[PDB]
Each structure stands twice: as structure tokens, then as C-alpha cells.
Amino acid sequence: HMKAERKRMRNRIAASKSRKRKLERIARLEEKVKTLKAQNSELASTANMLREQVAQLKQKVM
Amino acid sequence: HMKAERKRMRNRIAASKSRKRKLERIARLEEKVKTLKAQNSELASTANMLREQVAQLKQKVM
DNA sequence: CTCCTATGACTCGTCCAT
DNA sequence: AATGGACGAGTCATAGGAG
């Protein structure tokens, strides 16, 4: 098995990698929220589009 | 000047609070993603409802 | 059980802010 | 200032994975 000092080096490395991956996770989650919100905004504007569509078509029919 | 031992214990509390607040950020963000996915499904429903409704009204223009 | 990595908890030294 | 508060990072013990 690894000697004490070498074990400390490997664990220092593991700690830094695990802390780094925690930052990456936050960044991934934040970016998901962002694009979900913008997707959301585009669908909302679409429904608004299709709603002014149907009101117009209803006027043509009658 | 604070006694070193009083510092040590205030530092332990500080570190503990920071761990908790980090977990709460992860929660909030993961919850936000969940909620937004939901709203994306409702607005997609409403999208396809208004769409096949315009398809109807177009046929009705004959 | 061994042997390794990942992670919560702890401490220390250092930076921030005044 | 000297010092309260904040926080990066090294360390330890241990869970969990792979034997």
C-alpha cells in the first residue's frame, strides 16, 4: 500500500478534484435553469402568437 | 484579541454553516429545474392545443 | 477482509474590510 | 492599526466501490 506522505498527496488531489466538481455541478445546474427559462419565454410568446391567430381566424369565419 | 480556543470553536461553527448553505443552494437549484420542466410541459401542451385549433379554423375558411 | 478514491468534518493560515 | 468575519485548502476518518 502507499506510504503516508504519498497517501496525503493523493488525498490532497482527491479533495481538490471533488471541490472542483462541486463548482462544475453548480455551473451545470445554473445553465440548465437559464436555458429552461429562455425556452419557457419562447413558448410563452408562441402561445401569444397563436392566440392572436385564432381571434383573427374567428373574425374571418363569421 | 480573541482567545485562540474561542476562535477555533467559532471557526468550526462558520465551516458548518457554510456546508449547510451550500447544500441549500443545490436544493433550490435542483428544485428550480424541476419546476421549470413542469411549466415547459404545460406550455407545450397549450402549444399543441392552439396549433391543431388553428388547423381546424383554416379548414373552416373554405 | 485489502486497497483505493470521494467526501463530510475539522483545523489552520491567510485574505478582506474597517 | 488589530481584529471580526470569511474562506481556500490540507488533513483525517470513513463510506463505498472494486475487488
Swiss-Prot record, chains A, B:
It is found in: Nucleus. It comes from the Eukaryota. Residues 29-57 are annotated as: Leucine-zipper. Residues 3-62 form the bZIP domain. The record marks 21 as: Necessary for synergistic transcriptional activity with SMAD3. The modification Phosphothreonine is found at residue 35. Expressed in the developing and adult prostate and prostate cancer cells. The modification N6-acetyllysine is found at residue 20. Residues 3-28 are annotated as: Basic motif. Ubiquitinated by the SCF(FBXW7), leading to its degradation. Ubiquitination takes place following phosphorylation, that promotes interaction with FBXW7. Phosphorylated by CaMK4 and PRKDC; phosphorylation enhances the transcriptional activity. Phosphorylated by HIPK3. Phosphorylated by PLK3 following hypoxia or UV irradiation, leading to increase DNA-binding activity. Phosphorylated by VRK1. Belongs to the bZIP family. Jun subfamily. Heterodimer with either BATF3 or ATF7. Heterodimer with FOS. Heterodimer with FOSB isoform 1 and 2. Component of an AP-1 transcription factor complex composed of JUN-FOS heterodimers. As part of the AP-1 transcription factor complex, forms heterodimers with FOSB, thereby binding to the AP-1 consensus sequence and stimulating transcription. Interacts with FOS and FOSB isoform 1 and 2. The ATF7/JUN heterodimer is essential for ATF7 transactivation activity. Interacts with TSC22D3 (via N-terminus); the interaction inhibits the binding of active AP1 to its target DNA. Transcription factor that recognizes and binds to the AP-1 consensus motif 5'-TGA[GC]TCA-3'. Heterodimerizes with proteins of the FOS family to form an AP-1 transcription complex, thereby enhancing its DNA binding activity to the AP-1 consensus sequence 5'-TGA[GC]TCA-3' and enhancing its transcriptional activity. Together with FOSB, plays a role in activation-induced cell death of T cells by binding to the AP-1 promoter site of FASLG/CD95L, and inducing its transcription in response to activation of the TCR/CD3 signaling pathway. This is Transcription factor Jun. It comes from Homo sapiens (Human). The chain holds residues 254 to 313 of 331 of the full protein.
